[PDB]
């Protein structure tokens, strides 16, 4: 009967902004509510444990509230960073149960890095070894879209953000390619 829900299931915030992650539980009979972080295909790391007597728990930029009877818990993240980008999992422990966790489906947080000075342009990268096989690259403002190719033999990847630690320069890149020899990039 205890159903834990996190709505919205996907939140996208600009870098440096305060954000709010929501948790709901239908049954107020809980010992505590524990917020978790999950990097893709890796173990969970405990963020905050809130005991049913406590209304607030803080640790760095993470702040978490609880009201058992309301069936509500909020996780605040101040001055959000690209590094915070992960799936945030909410879980509770039931009265009369021996400590096992009941999880929500999680909220996938995407903190969009702040592109200082955008410069969009599409290029063509040639293979280092094999004959006449190539790929097209769209690189450089954390807003612009990338549509899935309606064509069958044309494959296009979703965007991803690299950070050059040395120069502190972030870059939104997305690649495409096709088995058809001589592919028009522009």
For another protein, the binding residues (CB under 8 A) are: 29, 31-32, 34, 40-46, 49, 51-53, 89, 91, 93, 95-106, 119, 121, 123-130, 133-135, 137, 139-140, 152, 155, 157-158, 160-167, 171, 173, 175, 177
Least Å from the CB of residue 76 to another protein: 22
Least Å from the CB of residue 126 to another protein: 6
Measured CA distances, 50 to 64, 83, 95, 129 (Å): 8, 24, 15, 56
Closer to another protein at the Cβ: 13 or 49?
Answer: 49
Least Å from the CB of residue 71 to another protein: 16
Measured CA distances, 169 to 112, 115, 136, 175 (Å): 14, 8, 22, 19
Least Å from the CB of residue 14 to another protein: 19
The single residue listed with the structure tokens 């930029």 is: 61
Closer to another protein at the Cβ: 80 or 113?
Answer: 113
Closer to another protein at the Cβ: 22 or 139?
Answer: 139
**Which structure tokens are listed for 157?**
């990847």
Residue 86 has a CB neighbour count (10 Å cut-off) of 19
Name, in order, each residue with C-beta under 8 angstroms of 131's C-beta and a sequence gap of 6 or more: none
């Amino acid at each position: 009967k205890q159903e834990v829900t996190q709505i919205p299931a996907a939140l996208s915030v600009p870098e440096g902004e305060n954000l709010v992650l929501n948790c709901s539980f239908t049954d107020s009979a809980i010992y505590n509510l524990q917020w978790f972080r999950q990097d893709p295909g890796k173990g969970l790391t405990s963020l905050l444990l809130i005991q049913s007597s406590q209304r607030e728990q803080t640790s760095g930029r993470l702040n978490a509230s609880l009201d058992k009877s309301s069936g509500r818990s909020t996780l605040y993240i101040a001055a959000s960073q690209p590094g915070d980008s992960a799936t945030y999992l909410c879980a509770v422990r039931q009265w009369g149960s021996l400590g096992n966790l009941i999880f929500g489906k999680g909220t996938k947080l995407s903190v969009k890095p702040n592109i200082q000075n955008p410069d969009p342009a599409v290029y063509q990268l040639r293979d280092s070894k094999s004959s006449d096989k190539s790929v097209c690259l769209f690189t450089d403002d954390s807003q612009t879209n990338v549509s899935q190719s309606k064509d069958s033999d044309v494959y296009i990847t979703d965007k991803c953000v690299l950070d050059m630690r040395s120069m502190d320069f972030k870059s939104n890149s997305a690649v495409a390619w096709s088995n058809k020899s001589d592919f028009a990039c522009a």
